[PDB]
Scaffold this motif. Structure first.
Motif, PDB file in Angstrom:
ATOM      1  N   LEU A  54       0.652  15.432 -11.022  1.00 35.55           N
ATOM      2  CA  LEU A  54      -0.790  15.162 -10.988  1.00 35.55           C
ATOM      3  C   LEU A  54      -1.565  16.320 -11.644  1.00 35.55           C
ATOM      4  CD1 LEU A  54      -1.302  13.565  -7.421  1.00 35.55           C
ATOM      5  CD2 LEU A  54      -0.832  12.384  -9.557  1.00 35.55           C
ATOM      6  N   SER A  68       6.084  17.360  -7.628  1.00 35.40           N
ATOM      7  CA  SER A  68       5.482  16.386  -6.714  1.00 35.40           C
ATOM      8  C   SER A  68       5.964  16.548  -5.259  1.00 35.40           C
ATOM      9  CB  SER A  68       5.699  14.962  -7.222  1.00 35.40           C
ATOM     10  OG  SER A  68       7.067  14.693  -7.471  1.00 35.40           O
ATOM     11  N   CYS A  84       0.840  -1.201   0.000  1.00 36.76           N
ATOM     12  CA  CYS A  84       0.000   0.000   0.000  1.00 36.76           C
ATOM     13  C   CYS A  84       0.880   1.259   0.000  1.00 36.76           C
ATOM     14  CB  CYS A  84      -0.975  -0.018   1.176  1.00 36.76           C
ATOM     15  SG  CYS A  84      -1.915   1.517   1.403  1.00 36.76           S
ATOM     16  N   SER A 132       4.083   1.437  -1.066  1.00 35.55           N
ATOM     17  CA  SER A 132       4.736   1.380  -2.373  1.00 35.55           C
ATOM     18  C   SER A 132       3.857   1.949  -3.493  1.00 35.55           C
ATOM     19  CB  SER A 132       5.142  -0.054  -2.694  1.00 35.55           C
ATOM     20  OG  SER A 132       5.959  -0.109  -3.850  1.00 35.55           O
ATOM     21  N   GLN A 133       2.527   1.738  -3.411  1.00 32.37           N
ATOM     22  CA  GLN A 133       1.575   2.237  -4.406  1.00 32.37           C
ATOM     23  C   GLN A 133       1.169   3.694  -4.208  1.00 32.37           C
ATOM     24  OE1 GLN A 133       0.359   0.928  -7.605  1.00 32.37           O
ATOM     25  NE2 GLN A 133       2.293  -0.119  -7.181  1.00 32.37           N
ATOM     26  N   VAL A 134       0.993   4.136  -2.940  1.00 34.81           N
ATOM     27  CA  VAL A 134       0.678   5.529  -2.589  1.00 34.81           C
ATOM     28  C   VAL A 134       1.863   6.407  -3.058  1.00 34.81           C
ATOM     29  CG1 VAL A 134       0.460   7.131  -0.594  1.00 34.81           C
ATOM     30  CG2 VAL A 134      -1.029   5.129  -0.744  1.00 34.81           C
ATOM     31  N   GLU A 135       3.099   5.873  -2.926  1.00 33.36           N
ATOM     32  CA  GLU A 135       4.352   6.508  -3.332  1.00 33.36           C
ATOM     33  C   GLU A 135       4.414   6.749  -4.839  1.00 33.36           C
ATOM     34  OE1 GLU A 135       7.402   7.783  -2.327  1.00 33.36           O
ATOM     35  OE2 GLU A 135       7.841   7.026  -0.306  1.00 33.36           O
ATOM     36  N   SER A 136       4.273   5.688  -5.656  1.00 32.85           N
ATOM     37  CA  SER A 136       4.344   5.790  -7.116  1.00 32.85           C
ATOM     38  C   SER A 136       3.182   6.548  -7.764  1.00 32.85           C
ATOM     39  CB  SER A 136       4.511   4.414  -7.751  1.00 32.85           C
ATOM     40  OG  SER A 136       3.398   3.581  -7.477  1.00 32.85           O
ATOM     41  N   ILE A 137       1.983   6.523  -7.156  1.00 34.92           N
ATOM     42  CA  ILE A 137       0.818   7.211  -7.721  1.00 34.92           C
ATOM     43  C   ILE A 137       0.706   8.664  -7.250  1.00 34.92           C
ATOM     44  CG2 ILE A 137      -1.729   7.221  -8.020  1.00 34.92           C
ATOM     45  CD1 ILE A 137      -1.405   3.982  -7.529  1.00 34.92           C
ATOM     46  N   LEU A 138       0.545   8.864  -5.930  1.00 34.25           N
ATOM     47  CA  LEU A 138       0.286  10.159  -5.300  1.00 34.25           C
ATOM     48  C   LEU A 138       1.494  10.994  -4.870  1.00 34.25           C
ATOM     49  CD1 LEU A 138      -2.521   8.491  -3.298  1.00 34.25           C
ATOM     50  CD2 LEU A 138      -3.047  10.319  -4.910  1.00 34.25           C
ATOM     51  N   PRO A 174       4.924  10.617  -8.542  1.00 33.54           N
ATOM     52  CA  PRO A 174       4.598  10.071  -9.869  1.00 33.54           C
ATOM     53  C   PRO A 174       5.596  10.497 -10.946  1.00 33.54           C
ATOM     54  CG  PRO A 174       3.102  11.865  -9.352  1.00 33.54           C
ATOM     55  CD  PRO A 174       4.110  11.813  -8.238  1.00 33.54           C
ATOM     56  N   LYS A 175       5.548   9.828 -12.125  1.00 35.23           N
ATOM     57  CA  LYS A 175       6.397  10.108 -13.288  1.00 35.23           C
ATOM     58  C   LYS A 175       6.132  11.548 -13.757  1.00 35.23           C
ATOM     59  CE  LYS A 175       7.449   8.359 -17.899  1.00 35.23           C
ATOM     60  NZ  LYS A 175       7.021   7.391 -18.944  1.00 35.23           N
TER      61      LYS A 175
END
Lengths: 102, 51
Positions: free
Chosen positions: B28, B41, B13, B15-21, B24-25
């Motif tokens: 947002l 970011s 969770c 790891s995913q909050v990190e890459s998305i929110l 991110p690449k």
């Protein structure tokens, strides 16, 4: 052929993978790549016009206008180091008179 | 996608909050103000400015 006297130097110095504005910001990297500058490549290779030896003059004005338009005036992505312009709502020259007129 | 199932893995969770929110690449959407301040970011905030 001196690096200091080269007109592509300020752009090639900005478009470097070692500059934090490129390494951390992918948007600025794609702005450089679209204008033919590879930030990963060394300074000399960035300023070098690859696979080119001589520039010949054709003298076509209509073709010159069409190219100044697509490259400088209205490009796909904004020209590098233009975050201030984009924050005021103008990514390029064509967008100025499109959104604001007087 | 039809149904969302809960796995309960906290490390996955984070790891995913990190890459998305958080990091991110691309930034947002609707964040031109943040980018003009020099921060695309959340990860860039403490990287460039610390107190």
């Amino acid at each position: 052929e001196d690096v200091r006297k080269n007109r592509l130097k300020p752009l090639a110095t900005y478009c470097s993978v070692h500059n934090p504005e490129i390494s951390f910001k992918v948007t600025n990297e794609m702005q450089c790549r679209e204008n033919s500058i590879d930030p990963t490549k060394p300074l000399a290779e960035r300023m070098k016009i690859e696979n080119c030896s001589i520039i010949e003059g054709t003298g076509n004005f209509d073709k010159c206008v069409s190219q100044v338009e697509s490259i400088l005036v209205a490009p796909k992505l904004p020209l590098p180091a233009n975050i201030e312009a984009a924050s005021s709502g103008f990514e390029s020259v064509d967008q100025v008179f499109r959104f604001a007129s007087s």
